[PDB]
Amino acid sequence: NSNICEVCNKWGRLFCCDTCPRSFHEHCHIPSVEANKNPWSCIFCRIKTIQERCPESQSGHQESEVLMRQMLPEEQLKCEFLLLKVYCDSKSCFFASEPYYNREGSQGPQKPMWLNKVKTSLNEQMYTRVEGFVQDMRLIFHNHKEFYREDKFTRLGIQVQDIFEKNFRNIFAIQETS
């Protein structure tokens, strides 16, 4: 196994996947690394299994169909994995915890949102469709762009949104387009 967390790239108290060489901090894995379970398989492995069991699941899909899907176990897992892929980028730190807004010339958003809030919502089964999860994730970046206006810091929102969107298209097998 690797000697650093796959998500935050630090050492520490690491749980090792039994079916691949990745390792995780307890609360870096999503869902949080399960108490017992020997062997244990990480989210990367669980997602690869879904694909292997249903190879046609990789054929292209329309985003509008994906969004309307109910949050059954396989969709719950895919959203957990997509969230984890955002945390894998170090620039996620800016979006992880609850923000506050006091900048001359800007007003805070009407509906603040942040990654740990999405993580709690997923854990608590608060989303009934994929659309709920995707709308909260896109709201993070939209709030940031609107609040930071012409400050160059706006680019952090564009960057982390790009990581979200690329991974969304990969995980949910969105039909490739020009």
Q: Cα 79–69–85 angle (5° rounding)?
A: 15
Q: How far is the CB of 157 from Zn ion (least distance, A)?
A: 23
Q: Assess 45 for contact with Zn ion (CB under 5 A).
A: yes
Q: Assess 28 for contact with Zn ion (CB under 5 A).
A: yes
The answer to whether the beta carbons of residues 117 and 111 sit under 8 Å apart is: no
Q: Residue 128 and residue 146: Cα distance in Å, rounded?
A: 28
The answer to whether the beta carbons of residues 81 and 31 sit under 8 Å apart is: no
Q: Which of 20, 88, 96, 174 binds Zn ion (CB under 5 A)?
A: 20
Number of residues that bind Zn ion (CB under 5 A): 11
Q: Assess 5 for contact with Zn ion (CB under 5 A).
A: yes
Closer to Zn ion by Cβ: residue 28 or 137? 28
Q: Assess 42 for contact with Zn ion (CB under 5 A).
A: yes
The answer to whether the beta carbons of residues 111 and 139 sit under 8 Å apart is: yes
Q: Residue 16 and residue 5: Cα distance in Å, rounded?
A: 9
Closer to Zn ion by Cβ: residue 4 or 174? 4
Binding site for Zn ion (CB under 5 A): 5, 7-8, 17, 20, 25, 28, 42, 44-45, 54
